[PDB]
């Protein structure tokens, strides 16, 4: 039955007289377009761009009465170029900065025709999606990024989107592994959105990203913390060694701003102060005061033999107050952003 | 016949014999093209390139007598692949550097006919537009970036552009988010421009962008101010501590030189001094003048009771003269560029 010539003259009677210009059941009820996604990978997430790049397989289902056929048991699979001769819903991603269908060998498109007219149409995409982020807690933040899927031309009177299978409609998300982030949760939505031209259908896919703190421990905190500890060595060197305690202090100032410059490029030029900015400036103040302490001591030792005791006394209290204050500040910082 | 067949026969009857080579109502009065814009976002603004990137929904609306149809009450929404077979205005953006129409799934275009022949036509576009920026007042500046819209092929004897809806013709300006800037207002223009080949219609969209100062306070001014204040420590340390007086003095001067030179890679090569450059140069003169102060304390102390008295008098004044002069300088700076 399924001889080659029979299949040809079956398909040709579907295409001959077909009109790409009109949606299925035009004038009638809306076309129900079922969506389905498989996330292949999330390439990267970038704050400086406020974007993340996504690679996925993307599928769509609908019924087109004009493409029903009988006498062939198969679910026919056709060369992808039939896509240029059929109707397809004009879905597009709102928040993409750049997108393209992969073109290796042949443009990665798929069409499969079932006997009852149910078309399945899908393609492989890499898309750079915009996602601006709440950097008010940068080292300890928790972001929400989404992909908005919407139809461009047709209103709700013509097309309805719905997730095929509900919670099962997107797969492979739990298999993703970002270096800087972990996928805490993902959730789905279906809703109408109304513009001046009418109501438009929408689906949206959303992720929640929580950052892996481990990076900053190596590159941000320990380096700055131990410089702060090093700056306290001034309190233990004898106060008569002016050439040493000043050089020690100013070098830590240079080192502290050196870390700051190597944090200049990694982040966007955001107006408000970030948690990392608060910490680095806090350490800079500790180093800055630790240097001013000598000036206060040197002035007192020479703005006169009891002053030999005054310099020792100020060193003895600074020997305690600075480490104690820094520990209190550090404890408040971590417990603030963890609890509050 | 039937609600399917009747529409198909109508569409074919419209386009059979249609001629895309000629504008609507050729040879009669000009065909008025109404248009409006909905902004999606401004992706970035770059001093280094003197440009900004805009993403928008761009729409057009014009009469064409040849596309009228009767007996159908619906506003036909044909598939977007019709656009290759109709006439469309040759509208274009004059200050465009690089730009494209998004092509995910299907190239983002819309068409919506009406019974009396009026057509609505739209695109989703991302455009990188050149913008000349007056950096003399940077970072306290405000910039007027614009998009210049024009018809290329047709003179004003054939085409007329008008903002559809007047003041409301552009929407979504308040969904523009930029870390560096905030929109003060947007204003619309309509004009006729003249070139050697005729007079052409023009429409313009303009934004008054005001910069946010938060970043530069946090990361540019304060590091300079603290280095300047650090440079006053010398006045409190003993004049006999020559090694400490110097090593810190040339360190602050060295740091100021580093700040002045290494920040400029983030912004374009410009021939005139910018406001913040004047500040970093101004604060630099203070720290160098402070270092010269010590040099002449050492000179009078060693090389020329005067050896004690005159050295003490100069050093004692500097503890109040430099801070007073710096505050006066700082006050004048922040009054000038804010007030005049």
């Amino acid at each position, epitope marked *: 039955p399924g001889n080659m010539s029979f299949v040809k003259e079956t398909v040709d009677k579907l295409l001959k007289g077909y009109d790409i210009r009109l949606r299925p059941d035009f004038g009638g009820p809306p076309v129900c377009v079922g969506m389905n996604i498989d996330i292949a990978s999330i390439d990267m997430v970038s704050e400086v761009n406020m974007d993340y790049t996504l690679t996925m397989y993307f599928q769509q289902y609908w019924r087109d009465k004009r493409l029903a056929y009988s006498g062939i048991p198969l679910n026919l699979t056709l060369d992808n170029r039939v896509a240029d001769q059929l109707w397809v819903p004009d879905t597009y991603f*709102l*928040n993409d900065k750049k997108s393209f269908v992969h073109g290796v060998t042949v443009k990665n498109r798929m069409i499969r025709l079932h006997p009852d007219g149910t078309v399945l149409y899908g393609l492989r995409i890499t898309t750079t999606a915009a996602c601006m982020m*709440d950097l008010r807690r940068y080292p300890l933040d928790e972001q*929400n990024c*989404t992909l*908005e899927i919407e139809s461009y031309g047709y209103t709700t009177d013509d097309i309805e989107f719905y997730w095929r299978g509900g919670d099962k409609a997107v797969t492979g998300v739990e298999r993703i592994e970002l270096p800087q982030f972990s996928i805490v949760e993902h959730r789905l939505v279906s809703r*109408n*959105v*109304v*513009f*001046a031209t009418g*109501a*438009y259908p929408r689906l*949206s896919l959303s992720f929640r990203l929580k950052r892996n703190i481990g990076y900053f421990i190596l590159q941000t905190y320990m380096p700055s913390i131990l410089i702060t500890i090093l700056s306290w060595v001034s309190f233990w060197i004898n106060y008569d060694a002016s050439a040493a305690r000043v050089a020690l202090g100013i070098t830590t100032v240079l080192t502290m701003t050196t870390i700051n410059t190597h944090l200049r490029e990694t982040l966007p030029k955001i107006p408000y102060v970030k948690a990392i900015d608060m910490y680095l400036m806090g350490c800079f103040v500790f180093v800055f005061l630790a240097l001013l302490e000598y000036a206060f001591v040197n002035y007192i030792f020479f703005s006169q033999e009891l002053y030999k005791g005054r310099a020792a006394a100020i060193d003895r209290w600074s020997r305690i107050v600075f480490p104690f204050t820094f520990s209190l500040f550090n404890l408040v910082y971590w417990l603030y952003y963890v609890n509050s | 016949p039937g609600n399917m067949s009747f529409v198909k026969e109508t569409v074919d009857k419209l386009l059979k014999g249609y001629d895309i080579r000629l504008r609507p109502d050729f040879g009669g009065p000009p065909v008025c093209v109404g248009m409006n814009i*909905d902004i999606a976002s401004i992706d970035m603004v770059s001093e280094v390139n003197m440009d900004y990137t805009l993403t928008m929904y761009f729409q057009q609306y014009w009469r064409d007598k040849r596309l009228a149809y009767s007996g159908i009450p619906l506003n036909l929404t044909l598939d977007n692949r019709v656009a290759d077979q109709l006439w469309v205005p040759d509208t274009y953006f004059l200050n465009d550097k690089k730009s494209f129409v998004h092509g995910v799934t299907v190239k983002n275009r819309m068409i919506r006919l009406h019974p009396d022949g009026t057509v609505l036509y739209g695109l989703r576009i991302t455009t990188t537009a050149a913008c000349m920026m007056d950096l003399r007042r940077y970072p306290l500046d405000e910039q007027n970036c614009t998009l210049e819209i024009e018809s290329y092929g047709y003179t004003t004897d054939d085409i007329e552009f008008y903002w559809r809806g007047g003041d409301k013709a552009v*929407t*979504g*300006v*308040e*969904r*523009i*988010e930029l870390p560096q800037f*905030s*929109i003060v207002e947007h204003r619309l223009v309509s004009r006729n421009v003249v070139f050697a080949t005729g007079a052409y219609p023009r429409l313009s969209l303009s934004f008054r962008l005001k910069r946010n100062i938060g970043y530069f306070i946090l990361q540019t001014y304060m590091p300079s101010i603290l280095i300047t204040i650090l440079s006053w420590v010398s006045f409190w340390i003993n004049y006999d501590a020559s090694a400490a007086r110097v090593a810190l003095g040339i360190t602050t001067v060295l740091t100021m030189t580093t700040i002045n030179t290494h920040l400029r890679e983030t912004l374009p090569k410009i021939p005139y001094v910018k406001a913040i450059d004047m500040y970093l140069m101004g604060c630099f003169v203070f720290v160098f003048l402070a270092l010269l102060e010590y040099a002449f304390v050492n000179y009078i102390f060693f090389s020329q009771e005067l050896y004690k008295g005159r050295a003490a008098a100069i050093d004692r004044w500097s503890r109040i003269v430099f801070p007073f002069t710096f505050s006066l300088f700082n006050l004048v700076y922040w009054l000038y560029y804010v007030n005049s």
Partner: nanobody, 108 residues
């Protein structure tokens, strides 16, 4: 006369950068009044209230203020506060707004 209405928000407001005011009167559909963009300060108003009402914000207190200046009898209505998603559609249509206030009342 004049009144001042205010709307306070708590939680993850950064996901909803735009907030607006909508008013309703007996025997009528819900109207648009105005909107505010968090951290941007830009605003737009309906023609019936243009230059009579103004809207402002306090980002630290997380509140939006609507200065309801120069009242007229036609302004009698309840004035719901509402929030809007970042990527939702046009401002003028209430169906785009997700979370809503309790519906304070004004009388004129």
């Amino acid at each position: 006369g004049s009144l001042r209405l205010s709307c306070a928000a708590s939680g993850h407001t950064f996901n909803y950068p735009i907030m607006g005011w909508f008013r309703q009167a007996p025997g009528k559909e819900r109207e648009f009044v105005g909107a505010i963009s968090w951290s941007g300060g830009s605003t737009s108003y309906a023609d019936s209230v243009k230059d009579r009402f103004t809207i402002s914000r306090d980002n630290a207190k997380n509140t939006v203020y609507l200065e309801m200046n120069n009242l007229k009898p036609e302004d009698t209505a309840v004035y719901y506060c509402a929030a809007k998603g970042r990527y939702s559609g046009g401002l003028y249509y209430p169906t785009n707004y997700d979370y809503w206030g309790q519906g304070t009342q004004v009388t004129v």
